[PDB]
Amino acid sequence: LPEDPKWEFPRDKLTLGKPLGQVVMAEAVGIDKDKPKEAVTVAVKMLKDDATEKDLSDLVSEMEMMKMIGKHKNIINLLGACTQDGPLYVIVAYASKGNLREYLRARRPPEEQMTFKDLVSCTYQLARGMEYLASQKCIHRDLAARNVLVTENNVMKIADFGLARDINNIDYYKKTTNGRLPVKWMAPEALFDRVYTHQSDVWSFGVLMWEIFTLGGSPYPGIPVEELFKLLKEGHRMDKPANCTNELYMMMRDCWHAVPSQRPTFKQLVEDLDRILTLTTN
Amino acid sequence: LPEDPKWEFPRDKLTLGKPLGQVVMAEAVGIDKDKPKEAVTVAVKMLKDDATEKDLSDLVSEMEMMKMIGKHKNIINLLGACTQDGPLYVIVAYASKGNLREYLRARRPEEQMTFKDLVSCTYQLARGMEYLASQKCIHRDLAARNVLVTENNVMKIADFGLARDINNIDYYKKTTNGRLPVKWMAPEALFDRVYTHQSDVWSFGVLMWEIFTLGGSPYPGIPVEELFKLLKEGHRMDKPANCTNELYMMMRDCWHAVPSQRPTFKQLVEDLDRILTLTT
């Protein structure tokens, strides 16, 4: 691996620990160049023993994407990496509350339940992360509750960029394109036309939204993967989650528009959500 | 998905259960056509809720492979499948004792393994691979975790998700063999982008090392990232503790750098047969 000084982190400064590809917790001393002696708790992603060549290159891509994206409030951020003489170590910010799916399912009505606002806030936050990601010419392609981390202060952090690509890094029209994307969150164009764009990410965003308001339910319950796309073409769409306003549900439905350009843009989702959230507070 | 009558199984007769790609235990009624009203406990492989397109093509390929391979005492066997109107269910015999790796780590000094057991366990698998080799099929993912053991401690090779017909390999293309766990993988599979029955013999060698270490993890301490450079420089695992020099020499043969210089499964069988009869 090419030596990238700015990101490189001393292995002797890194203390591995409990597990959380493969991710583990760890103490990174002085990782923050503004407290050279302070041991910071971080999360380290690495290869498992049964790793394959593709696994390695996927982890290397995930890391490089994290370098290109830049910093943002709603995006899990890279703290550094151990890429010389030894196992590849991608060191990122540690989210104590774990992933969003486990998180939501965790506080379901009999923990500390989630208010309507808390849900709306969660959605608004992720829309910002994506709105940003899109301004960075980056497509995630793997948006889902399980790929969102939640901090101690309940800040939503989008993670798992193993599949994220630059808008131009996609072989439009080839059969192999989009073959590794979980279908229940995947936009039809991704498969039928073998293309992927920001609008494809909004479709996924719609499913993530449905996941949030169902407090972590599983999309298209009872519907097999092998039969989904047929139904999706026949027009099928998930039902308005339990306690979910018809407004937020129509928002989801819009994300699930068959015509990619008729779906809202992340910028638009952000403004609507910002409106809903604000009026909720008042 | 094509309608293949010979293997199809009525969904109503199937009853999924506790979990064991994704595998779950199940009750298949009259899956054994000689006992139309007897319900047989079987294992069912299906896709997961977060499945991807490739996952499906992969499961489908797994099934077809088993269809073409045929039956053999040391290969887990396909019992039938639900391929029409609904999820894809690949039904296979149920190995009551789990995967060889767990099985072995379990009885570590819960009733210990004797040398002869290890030798037998080895021989059974060698017969499995010899048969596979004769069916012109490369496994590509041979490893203790991928071997199931039935109630009668019979060894059954399983996990055919990456197995291809010898001729169905994209010789020399960069992407070839990019999904095979490197620590069981043969050098050439990566350095020349090819795969032959001889690559499988290498994996088998690693399998042998697993068996005799009673479930050890290959190349302990050596990270995947720096394995292939060591392999190139001639690095090879040391003799497992409770393993005969003879058996270890056999492992090293399986790990000869030159593929044509590694034993064939037929030979592996014969020697193992010879060593085993003597242990008995």
From Swiss-Prot, chain A:
The active site is at D142 (proton acceptor). GO terms for biological process: angiogenesis; animal organ morphogenesis; apoptotic process; axonogenesis; bone development; bone mineralization; bone morphogenesis; branch elongation involved in salivary gland morphogenesis. ATP binds at K45, A93, Y94, A95, N99. The keyword Ribosomal protein does not apply. Its main location: membrane. Changing A144T: In LADD1; strongly reduced kinase activity. It is found in: Cell membrane; Golgi apparatus; Cytoplasmic vesicle. GO terms for cellular component: cell cortex; cell surface; cytoplasm; cytoplasmic vesicle; excitatory synapse; extracellular region; Golgi apparatus; membrane. Autophosphorylated. Binding of FGF family members together with heparan sulfate proteoglycan or heparin promotes receptor dimerization and autophosphorylation on several tyrosine residues. Autophosphorylation occurs in trans between the two FGFR molecules present in the dimer. N-glycosylated in the endoplasmic reticulum. The N-glycan chains undergo further maturation to an Endo H-resistant form in the Golgi apparatus. GO terms for molecular function: ATP binding; fibroblast growth factor binding; fibroblast growth factor receptor activity; heparin binding; identical protein binding; protein homodimerization activity; protein tyrosine kinase activity. Residues 1-282 are cytoplasmic. It is linked to Crouzon syndrome: An autosomal dominant syndrome characterized by craniosynostosis, hypertelorism, exophthalmos and external strabismus, parrot-beaked nose, short upper lip, hypoplastic maxilla, and a relative mandibular prognathism. Jackson-Weiss syndrome: An autosomal dominant craniosynostosis syndrome characterized by craniofacial abnormalities and abnormality of the feet: broad great toes with medial deviation and tarsal-metatarsal coalescence. Tyrosine-protein kinase that acts as a cell-surface receptor for fibroblast growth factors and plays an essential role in the regulation of cell proliferation, differentiation, migration and apoptosis, and in the regulation of embryonic development. Required for normal embryonic patterning, trophoblast function, limb bud development, lung morphogenesis, osteogenesis and skin development. Plays an essential role in the regulation of osteoblast differentiation, proliferation and apoptosis, and is required for normal skeleton development. The second and third Ig-like domains directly interact with fibroblast growth factors (FGF) and heparan sulfate proteoglycans. Alternative splicing events affecting the third Ig-like domain are crucial for ligand selectivity. Monomer. Homodimer after ligand binding. Interacts predominantly with FGF1 and FGF2, but can also interact with FGF3, FGF4, FGF6, FGF7, FGF8, FGF9, FGF10, FGF17, FGF18 and FGF22 (in vitro). Ligand specificity is determined by tissue-specific expression of isoforms, and differences in the third Ig-like domain are crucial for ligand specificity. Isoform 1 has high affinity for FGF1 and FGF2, but low affinity for FGF7. Isoform 3 has high affinity for FGF1 and FGF7, and has much higher affinity for FGF7 than isoform 1 (in vitro). This is Fibroblast growth factor receptor 2. It comes from Homo sapiens (Human). The gene is FGFR2.
